[PDB]
Each structure stands twice: as structure tokens, then as C-alpha cells.
Amino acid sequence: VETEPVQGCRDFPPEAMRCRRHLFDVFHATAKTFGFEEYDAPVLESEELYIRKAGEEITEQMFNFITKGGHRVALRPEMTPSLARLLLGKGRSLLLPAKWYSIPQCWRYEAITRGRRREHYQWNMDIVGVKSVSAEVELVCAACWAMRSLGLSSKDVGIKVNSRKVLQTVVEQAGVTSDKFAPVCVIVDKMEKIPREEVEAQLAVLGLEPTVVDAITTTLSLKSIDEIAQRVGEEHEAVKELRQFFEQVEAYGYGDWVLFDASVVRGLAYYTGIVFEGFDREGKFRALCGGGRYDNLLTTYGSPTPIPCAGFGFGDCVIVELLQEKRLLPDIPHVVDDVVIPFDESMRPHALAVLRRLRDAGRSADIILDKKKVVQAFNYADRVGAVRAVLVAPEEWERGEVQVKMLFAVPLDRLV
Amino acid sequence: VETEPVQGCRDFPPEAMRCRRHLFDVFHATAKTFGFEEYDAPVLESEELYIRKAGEEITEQMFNFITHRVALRPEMTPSLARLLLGKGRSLLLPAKWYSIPQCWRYEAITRGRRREHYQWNMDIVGVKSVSAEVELVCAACWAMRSLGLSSKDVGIKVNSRKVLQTVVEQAGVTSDKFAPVCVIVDKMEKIPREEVEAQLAVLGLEPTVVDAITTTLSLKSIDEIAQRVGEEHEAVKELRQFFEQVEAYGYGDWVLFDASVVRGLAYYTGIVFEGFDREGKFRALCGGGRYDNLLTTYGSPTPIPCAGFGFGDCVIVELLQEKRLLPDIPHVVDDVVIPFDESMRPHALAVLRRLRDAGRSADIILDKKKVVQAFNYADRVGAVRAVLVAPEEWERGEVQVKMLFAVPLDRLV
Numbered sequence A: 001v002e003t004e005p006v007q008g009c010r011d012f013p014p015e016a017m018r019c020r021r022h023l024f025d026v027f028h029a030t031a032k033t034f035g036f037e038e039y040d041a042p043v044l045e046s047e048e049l050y051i052r053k054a055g056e057e058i059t060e061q062m063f064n065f066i067t068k069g070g071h072r073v074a075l076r077p078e079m080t081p082s083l084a085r086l087l088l089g090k091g092r093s094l095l096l097p098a099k100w101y102s103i104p105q106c107w108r109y110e111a112i113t114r115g116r117r118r119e120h121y122q123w124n125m126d127i128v129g130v131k132s133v134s135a136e137v138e139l140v141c142a143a144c145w146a147m148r149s150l151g152l153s154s155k156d157v158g159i160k161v162n163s164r165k166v167l168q169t170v171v172e173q174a175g176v177t178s179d180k181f182a183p184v185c186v187i188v189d190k191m192e193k194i195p196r197e198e199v200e201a202q203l204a205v206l207g208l209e210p211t212v213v214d215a216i217t218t219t220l221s222l223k224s225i226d227e228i229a230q231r232v233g234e235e236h237e238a239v240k241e242l243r244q245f246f247e248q249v250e251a252y253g254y255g256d257w258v259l260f261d262a263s264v265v266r267g268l269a270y271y272t273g274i275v276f277e278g279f280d281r282e283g284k285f286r287a288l289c290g291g292g293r294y295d296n297l298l299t300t301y302g303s304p305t306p307i308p309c310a311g312f313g314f315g316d317c318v319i320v321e322l323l324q325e326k327r328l329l330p331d332i333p334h335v336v337d338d339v340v341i342p343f344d345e346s347m348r349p350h351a352l353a354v355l356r357r358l359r360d361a362g363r364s365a366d367i368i369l370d371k372k373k374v375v376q377a378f379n380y381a382d383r384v385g386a387v388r389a390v391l392v393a394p395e396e397w398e399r400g401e402v403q404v405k406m407l408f409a410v411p412l413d414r415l416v
Numbered sequence B: 001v002e003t004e005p006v007q008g009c010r011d012f013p014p015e016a017m018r019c020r021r022h023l024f025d026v027f028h029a030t031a032k033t034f035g036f037e038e039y040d041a042p043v044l045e046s047e048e049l050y051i052r053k054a055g056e057e058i059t060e061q062m063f064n065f066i067t068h069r070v071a072l073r074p075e076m077t078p079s080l081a082r083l084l085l086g087k088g089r090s091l092l093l094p095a096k097w098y099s100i101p102q103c104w105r106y107e108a109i110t111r112g113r114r115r116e117h118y119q120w121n122m123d124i125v126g127v128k129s130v131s132a133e134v135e136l137v138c139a140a141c142w143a144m145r146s147l148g149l150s151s152k153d154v155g156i157k158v159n160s161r162k163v164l165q166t167v168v169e170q171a172g173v174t175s176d177k178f179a180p181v182c183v184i185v186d187k188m189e190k191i192p193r194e195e196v197e198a199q200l201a202v203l204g205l206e207p208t209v210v211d212a213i214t215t216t217l218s219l220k221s222i223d224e225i226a227q228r229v230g231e232e233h234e235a236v237k238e239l240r241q242f243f244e245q246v247e248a249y250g251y252g253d254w255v256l257f258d259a260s261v262v263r264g265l266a267y268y269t270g271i272v273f274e275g276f277d278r279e280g281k282f283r284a285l286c287g288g289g290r291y292d293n294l295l296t297t298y299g300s301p302t303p304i305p306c307a308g309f310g311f312g313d314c315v316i317v318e319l320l321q322e323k324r325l326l327p328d329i330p331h332v333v334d335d336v337v338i339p340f341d342e343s344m345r346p347h348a349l350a351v352l353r354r355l356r357d358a359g360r361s362a363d364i365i366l367d368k369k370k371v372v373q374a375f376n377y378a379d380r381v382g383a384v385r386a387v388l389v390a391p392e393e394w395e396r397g398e399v400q401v402k403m404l405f406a407v408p409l410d411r412l413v
């Protein structure tokens, strides 16, 4: 007798489902406008695929189980690995650069509320085979367009930007093997989420000294690009890469949308370079979206030659919270072009004839299926939001006509 | 280093993915043309939901596990019923709901029955008469016709479980054993007569009642139905209406009566149907039927008539590929913006925005590459136009356009 859905999952009845479609049309449209090709993988993947274990939180937050037949498995918590699989699968036949997108469902055994439910759809845009920041620029501009398309602006939403190289330098400059670095990126991401002493505690636990911990704290708090230059020199990849990224987005004309934020690092250990996170200016919700460059990952899965990648994920939850707070998700109710009312059931076969004729003429149309009275029919027309009620009565039908109410006798040739 | 997908699942790279979109787009268009509303549930559901156990094959063919315990859906209908009942008193009827959910059966992989599949579900809820089924069956047809098929390629076989339900009820077996008989009897297509008859004797039934069933299944036409059960009978007059109404709608040649059709799912109550290719090459294209009692079974305080069908994304494709109706249509994009050298990049971007604003689909060379390479890229991604942004021209407020001379920035669109 049980009606509620599993755990923190969402049901999508028509009313809700429309909102989703509205949201998706946009992603697709934006992809197309930006020239991305759609792909998809199976939601269920091999457990083996997600073996990185870089101190992350995603490894245990897994819907994993065993089929017996074939080997053990898990429902995907992110698309990227599944992309990498498909890419590498394509092998020598893979033509580059490639620009691929997808709107896959994703499963994290996570903490339900607020806007981080146990299942979520995630719009992935990825550029593969592009070395320069030209990629990230495009990608970030793609998120913006989408949002702008949804009815947002730079004043509602921002995108914070940074490069992990800045950090990667600082660490490499003190005496710790890149060994412990990715874990530091996991730790350091928590600075937004929790207080400084507990981050600094976990970094001391990873073995690091206090004086190196200090350096990290400082870097994270660095105010601008100009200021980056002074801790690492204007002659430096990270520096000139950001300046290009920023000059290019300003050129494309989304200047107000982005800004530098030294704090941004991301919680996934395969990012190599530039990284970004979409946020609402008021600072109400978790990240709208997040992404960055991941050059080495494809080598990690075993590409005989390393393949640069950048790309982001864009959730379907937080974004909606924001649109609903900005009253940009007005329910647009179901409509249909025509409702065909058989006068009595003897007219039904003629009604059908008429219905076919409209559906052929490319109309969207509906027909009263059970025997019901004339009022009820009109009532139905109103419920389903019909633009027009075509009543098929006999007196008229014999004269080769039907009745039409808009929401007088019309012959068929003048109907459609 | 592992590239292949899990078990009998399909990867969908862009090339394949397009074929899917082409299919789904028809599914959606047809729905809309027929006035269905789209819905979706989570692919993962409670194990509890699929507890019927009417001698079926679907109960063990399950991707079940524990997190309460759960399983990945093998059919949408239960999940629909859940949502419907969930809506409660707020549910407005009749309702016409559709969806294209993925589904997971721990089944037998080849040929056209892979371990995962998408399934287009159309369901009418709250309609007593065959008017529903008619609509539903016409909906499948439209889709197919939309895909480029015809009555000569594909048929839809039709029948009513009441015909059988009578015959059994008329011999002395409780409805108790009936649904199991429908499971057994469905296998007649798939396997030989003696093994069906064996399993029915195993369900307890006599030989003389087994005979009656064999006979009913083989009944040639509706006229003939009349003679074993009277013209005055629900099943008989229901079919005659169904058939007269489809003929009216103008899909006469698409359907036909076949006494053998019963379906392998135990919740069907009345009319049932199955889509097939006339040549008899592949498993059922699609299948459905009326299921009035199911909603009471999940606990509706008043029974709610339903009909609806599922329409797989696998078999159908096998057929379209055999009829050469799935020509690969390769990716294309309106424009490719080539910065002459990297110094023009920021202007190139300016131009790219201007096109994307004008509603064009456009692309831009992202890495530094030579002029030829650019044009080569243009060809690869199938561009209709190459907008080279060179400096001599840019200063005069223009760009170079090659179609696959010099043009002013306001006249690219």
C-alpha cells in the first residue's frame, strides 16, 4: 500500500515533470548552441571503475552491490569516469577535440537535505583534447548561457575561479612529495564548509608541518591575481593561465559573471589545473555547479598518451531551489490543441475520423473516451486546457460539418 | 584499464546516442500528438513493490540488493501505480500519462532482449471502455508510421483474457490457478505444445480442461469466439468495438485478431496486444493491455481501470536497421569561428557570442592551430559555414566567410 519514494529520491508526476523538462530543454539547447554532442552510459557501472581512494568522501558514499553474474557493481555517483571509459574505448577512432555532453542521473549515499538529495540529475559538459584555457572559458560561458537562459543574471549568480597549480606549487616548494597533495586538496576544500582549526588539524595529521600549513592557509586567502603573481611570480603557468581565462571571458561578454576566489579547490582529486564553482550571490545554497581541468585522469585509466580534458557537472536540485526563490519557475500547466467530443456514442466512429484528421494536420488532440454527458466533456476540455472543443454532432455531420467552441458550424475542409 | 560496459548493457556514444534521440523524439511527439503528459519515477525502487509471485519469470530476474532493501525496476507500471495512488484524492481522471524509463531484467542478453532497455510507456487511467485500448494501440501505430514503417512491415495482434477467464471459470478451477495459466499459456509461441500441457497438468488441471484451453488459443476469429462463448458476452462485443473503432480511426490494416496472444504478466484483466514484424523475425516490438484490478491490489479504496503498453528501444531498432530506416545522420553545426592567429581570439569570441545570440549553433577553434587545420575541423564537425576572423578585415569591421567573400559583422545574422 506504500506510496512514498525510496529514501531521498524524488517522484516526478506531470506537474513536477514539466519543471524538469523546462530545465532540460535549456541544457540541451545550450549544448547545441555551443556545439556539444550528446552521449550516455549505463547508470550502473563496475565497482572497479571508481577505485582512486585519494582520501575522498565519494568512495564510501556508494550504492554498491553484487550481481553474482558478471562481477560486482555500483550505481554511478559521477559521469566523468564513465566518460573516460567510453573515450578510451573509442581508442584510435576518437577524433579530437571532442565536445560531449550528457544529463545523467547520479547516486550518492549522501546526507539528503538540504539541496543534496540521495539522487540527482547532473548536466555534464566536457571538452576533450584541448590544452589551453580556451576550453574552460567556453565551458564556463556555457554554464552562464544556460543560467541566463533560465532567467538569471550576473547579480543573482556568480562563478568563482582558481587554479590548483598555485597550490600544487606551494606544496611542491615545501618538502612534501606530490604523494600527499590530492589529499590536501580534499582537506583544503572543507575550508568553506568548516572552521580553520579542524582543517589545520587534519593537515598536521597528514604529516605536514605547521609552517607549511600556514603557507596553505595564506594561499587560500590570497585576494587577487595580481597578488598571486607576488607569491609565485608573474612568469608562471597558473598566473598567465588565469589572466587569459579572465581576458577571454570578458571578450565573450560574460565579465560580471566570473571572479577570482583563491579558496576554490573542489572535492574531487583528479583536477589538475583551473577549477570553478557556481554560486548564488546571497550565499544561500550549496554549489550550483562545479568543474575544472583534469589532464592526467585519462592516463590514470590507461591511455597510451595523456589526453587533456576539462568539464563540469551541473545539478538539477540546487539550481531549482534558486529559481523557485527568485520566482522563475512559474508552473505552466498542461495544454492540448483540441478536444473531440462525440455528441453521443453513435458519433464516436465519426469523432475518431475527425481526431485522426487533426493529429495528421500536426495538431495535438484528445478525445472523450468514456460515454459522458455534454457538460462533462466541456469540463474535461477545460481540465486538460484545450484551446478548442470540436463537438461532433449528427445534424452537422450529415451536412459534413462539426461544431467548434473556442476557449458555430464548421465544415471539415475549413477545420484543418 | 577496463572499457567494456557492465553485463548486457549498452554504452551510448554520440553516434549511437543520436539513433536513440531519433527514437525517443518520435515517442515524445506521438505522446504530445495524442495528448499524453510525461512523468518519471526513480529507477531504483523498494523490493516490496514487486511482490506478486503469480508463477511469473520476472520475480527472480531482478537486480535486487540492500542499502530498507531495494531493486532496480524491471517494469514501470508498478511505479506508476505507486505515483497514481500517491496522488490520492487529488488525482484527476481520466489521466493519460507517459514515460521512457530504463528497465533492468537479469535476463538472457541476446538476441534483442539485453540486460537493460529503455521502454516507452503509454497508460490511460480511469477509462472503462475499449476506447482506451483503441487510442493506445493507435498510438503505437502512429509512432511506428512516424519512424517510417507501414502495416505491411509490422502488425499488432489483439485478444481478450476474458475469453480464457471464462473457459477456465467454466471448468471447475477457482480463479486461484488462472493467472498462472496465463503465464503458462503465453509460452505456446515460444515452445512446443506438450511441455505447456505438461505444466498445466502440473498446476493440477485435468486433460479435458487442458484440451479446452488448447482449442481456445487456436480459435481463428471473433465470429468463432462467439460460438464457444456466445455473441452476448463482454469479451466478444468488446473486441468488435475495439476493431470497429480502430478501423474508424483509419488503422484497419495495422491490427488483427490472434487467439494465441495472452502476455506474460499476471495483472492483465481484459484486452491484450503485442506488436510484431510480419516476417516473424524478432521478439515482440511492444506489448500491453487492460489491467483494472491492479490498483485495488496495491490498495486503492476504489478500483481504478487502467490500460497501457510498453514499447522497447531494442527490437524496434533491429527492425528499422533491417529495413534500412536508420540512416546515420551525422553531427552538424551552423558555424565555425576561426581566429586568424591568436591575437584575433578575443575578437573571434566577440563574433561567436554574436552568432550564438542570433540563435545560431556555433563553435570555435580553441587551441592554436593553422588555417588549414581549422578548415579541416570545420569539415569534421560538419559546419555549414566557416567564419574566419582576420585582422585586415576586422579593422574594416568585417570577417571572412567561406560556405561549405568578405562580410560585415551585422550581416552574419
Ligand SMILES: Nc1ncnc2c1ncn2[C@@H]1O[C@H](COP(=O)([O-])OC(=O)[C@@H]([NH3+])Cc2c[nH]cn2)[C@@H](O)[C@H]1O
Residues within 6 Å of the ligand: A077, A078, A079, A080, A108, A110, A115, A116, A117, A118, A119, A120, A122, A124, A125, A126, A268, A286, A287, A288, A289, A290, A291, A292, A310, A311, A312, A313, A314, A315, A316, A317, A318, A319
Ligand atoms: N547530492 C547532490 N544533490 C544535488 N546536486 C548535486 C549533488 N551532488 C552534486 N550535485 C551537483 O553537481 C555539482 C557538483 O558535482 P561534482 O563536481 O561534485 O561531481 C562531478 O561530476 C564532477 N566530476 C564535475 C565534473 C564534470 N566533468 C568534469 N568534472 C554540484 O554543483 C551540484 O549541483
Ligand SMILES: Nc1ncnc2c1ncn2[C@@H]1O[C@H](COP(=O)([O-])OC(=O)[C@@H]([NH3+])Cc2c[nH]cn2)[C@@H](O)[C@H]1O
Residues within 6 Å of the ligand: B074, B075, B076, B077, B105, B107, B112, B113, B114, B115, B117, B119, B121, B122, B123, B264, B265, B284, B285, B286, B287, B288, B289, B307, B308, B309, B310, B311, B312, B313, B314, B315
Ligand atoms: N529485454 C528486453 N529487450 C528488449 N525489449 C524489451 C525487453 N524487455 C522488455 N522489452 C520491451 O517491453 C515489452 C515487454 O515488456 P512487457 O510489456 O512484457 O512488461 C511491461 O513493461 C509492462 N509494464 C507493459 C505494460 C505497461 N502498462 C501496461 N502494460 C516488449 O514488447 C519490448 O518492447
Ligand SMILES: [Cl-]
Residues within 6 Å of the ligand: none
Ligand atoms: Cl530526454
